[PDB]
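Narrative progress, year one. The postdoctoral researcher (J.K.) led the effort to move from monomer predictions toward full complexes, under supervision of the PI. The following entry was the first complex the group processed end to end, covering 650 residues in total.
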Amino acid sequence: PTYPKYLLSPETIEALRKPTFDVWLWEPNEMLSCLEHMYHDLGLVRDFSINPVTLRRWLFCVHDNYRNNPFHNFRHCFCVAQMMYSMVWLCSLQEKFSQTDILILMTAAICHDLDHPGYNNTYQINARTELAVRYNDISPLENHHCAVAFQILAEPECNIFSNIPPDGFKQIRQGMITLILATDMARHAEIMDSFKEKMENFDYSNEEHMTLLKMILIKCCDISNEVRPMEVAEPWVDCLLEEYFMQSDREKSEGLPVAPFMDRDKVTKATAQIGFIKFVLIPMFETVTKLFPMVEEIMLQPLWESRDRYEELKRIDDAMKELQ
Amino acid sequence: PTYPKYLLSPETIEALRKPTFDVWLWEPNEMLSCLEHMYHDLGLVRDFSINPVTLRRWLFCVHDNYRNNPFHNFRHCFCVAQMMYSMVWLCSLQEKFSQTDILILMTAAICHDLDHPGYNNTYQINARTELAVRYNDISPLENHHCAVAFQILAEPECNIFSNIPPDGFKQIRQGMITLILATDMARHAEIMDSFKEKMENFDYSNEEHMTLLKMILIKCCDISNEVRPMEVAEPWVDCLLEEYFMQSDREKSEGLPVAPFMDRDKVTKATAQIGFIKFVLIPMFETVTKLFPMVEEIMLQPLWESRDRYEELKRIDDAMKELQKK
Ligand SMILES: CC(C)Cn1c(=O)n(C)c(=O)c2nc[nH]c21
Ligand SMILES: CC(C)Cn1c(=O)n(C)c(=O)c2nc[nH]c21
Ligand SMILES: [Mg+2]
Ligand SMILES: [Mg+2]
Ligand SMILES: [Zn+2]
Ligand SMILES: [Zn+2]
């Protein structure tokens, strides 16, 4: 008659494939099911012999290792993985990548922010936290994310890779590590040039080229909120600042340097996103379009719109601050 | 009168400056004193307001954080540190390096192998160890040595940097982290090339040129046993293979791969050092000699000798196994 929520309706399974899928409409359970479906759907369960029950526990254990942060939480996790999923279709990645690579992109996307503490690397380093000390100031967050990802995959009951020859595990593990560590925005500029370089004459056969592409791909999905529909996109800006301000305050109480872009007294939903969209998002997606031109209409388009919308929104804010 | 051991004689203090020092005669405490003496003698206690007592609690704490592996232990720690000390004099480093770099080189050497487990990075990764998982297969050992180093310095009673301004702290931490991580032999080639490349036209005023020099410097001190006198050097080779075989054993009975150079059946004290001296040691100290010629005679020399000796041993060593085997 009427089936429970964790039984995705054939409509859901259809929307899930596109970047428009409203990420806010579901509860963890439902989202967990979505992720589950993704692995079966991409043939990952099939091509690697992933025990379906294990996939269930793994995802459940993954969801449990994400803190309840305003921004870097389980729903964000979902966003990145779902956006990665979208791009697999939109770009026909299965025509360019081996099922193994696809496994990497997806698993990596899902694990990229495991146990994120709600404070960036700059804070971890200045506050000389355990993460900072443990990782010798080298992308402590990402290094931690990655470690937790594999601590989980080390639990036999969650080891969704239990039936992969050891030679494969090594290749998958390497790839994931690379990708997850590539999400530290500190390395953005560096990664973009490496990619832009090999781009002058891309080569899907060349391995280094492909690793950069996978790197660029996970980065895209990771900060792809602004690509999403304006209603689903805006609320995340609030979550983000909610986190940035939480850190800027703490930094102030503890007398640690405060990044201006996180300063509660200088930031507004507008000024924050305008620079990010114009100078980080657009350019990155721009160069990716060179390889997958259908990305221009599906992701570059909403970005241009959000840029204008936010730019105009500041234009307005300035006029108001003026009257006063 | 007859003073106690922890009281260094002016002879020892004099011997501590040459690479011919018998790193075997001394016991932990005496060695701690030698280390302590180096920090004073180099002007580090002076130029960094190091509380003289903290310096001792720290050395004590560092020592207590080294395992009792046949090779990778506190006495090795002391070797590398004492070698670095020698290098500073022999090469007049106080002329080309700031006291901050001299600080970095010394502290980095003393901490370079902190809490070493006894099994290399290859074992850590393949055995999917807690360390390999923690540092995502990235120089997990060195990364660890480094972390422990700073957790020790995080203790107020062991913090020899407590009187250094925060900016200088950051600067030192950065350098220490770079040098310790640079001791991962897996990077020996990469690092060597960078140095030889910057070596085409070396510039003592170029930060990058100096960073490679320091990396090369600590690497030289780290694997500098064979540079020492035959009787001081040799016993270390045994200690190393004892640790190597221990691993290859564990590896064979855990189904994990085993390196030939660590295989109990294909490695003699000789075959291990002949190749290592000819392809790793000599080459490195050679390029370093371009920068410091006096290095050739005091270190490149005992290496050629060592190389010749081991090659000699290998012959009689081989002949012997031609009486064995049916
Ligand atoms: C400095 C800037 C890149 C910081 N930054 C960021 O890292 N992410 C992920 C954002 O979404 C964002 N939005 C504005 N600034 C941002
Ligand atoms: C990785 C490292 C153990 C290699 N290593 C070393 O450090 N020393 C001092 C040797 O004598 C040696 N001989 C072979 N490999 C060696
Ligand atoms: Mg991140
Ligand atoms: Mg080491
Ligand atoms: Zn993220
Ligand atoms: Zn060492």
